[PDB]
Amino acid sequence: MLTDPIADMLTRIRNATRVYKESTDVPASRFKEEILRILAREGFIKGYERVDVDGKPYLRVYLKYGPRRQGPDPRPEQVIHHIRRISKPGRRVYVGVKEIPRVRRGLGIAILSTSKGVLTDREARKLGVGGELICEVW
């Protein structure tokens, strides 16, 4: 049935970038969108937009890389080095504000969902609230 849609997205994304695709559809959900917004803003993706395919709502995700590279193996560095689900249907994961993780001494993000909406970790910390720890990303 597809059991964790948000896992899915992270994975679709993880997969498309390692073969350096320009873009990936992922079937669209409001929540998925909210996570994408962060990705976009935090400068991990170029951007994203709604689209249809076979006339059902998707989300094209435009991915983003580094420059062509030095010697044998000219593959660009990845912008999204690591994108990992934390909370999962098997095991939900929640943090109080005092215990939100700091991803790769701040060079990374942790999307995290609160009752004040979906936020990066600094975002959440600032508005002094915690919630479901969605994924890390660096």
Binding site: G90, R91, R92, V93, Y94
Partner: protein
Amino acid sequence: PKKVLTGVVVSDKMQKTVTVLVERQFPHPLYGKVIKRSKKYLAHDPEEKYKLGDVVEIIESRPISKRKRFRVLRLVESGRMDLVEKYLIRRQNYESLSK
């Protein structure tokens, strides 16, 4: 404050008494996952009033018997025989577990 618990009536087979199944759920100390867990309470129903399938509040009470220690505070909703159904089948699984 006298504890208030809310559950499902799964037995009226006793005079002035009801058995109430109260589910509780929480994060498992080591393994994290939110796990369910429940307990039946025998509660005081003096006007043999609440019946099989009612959802009720249960309130911490001055003792009535050995094991009667709660009284039926009120009714939340009637009908919920699915919940009783759940309990009953789980109960009958038990035969199909010995020798």
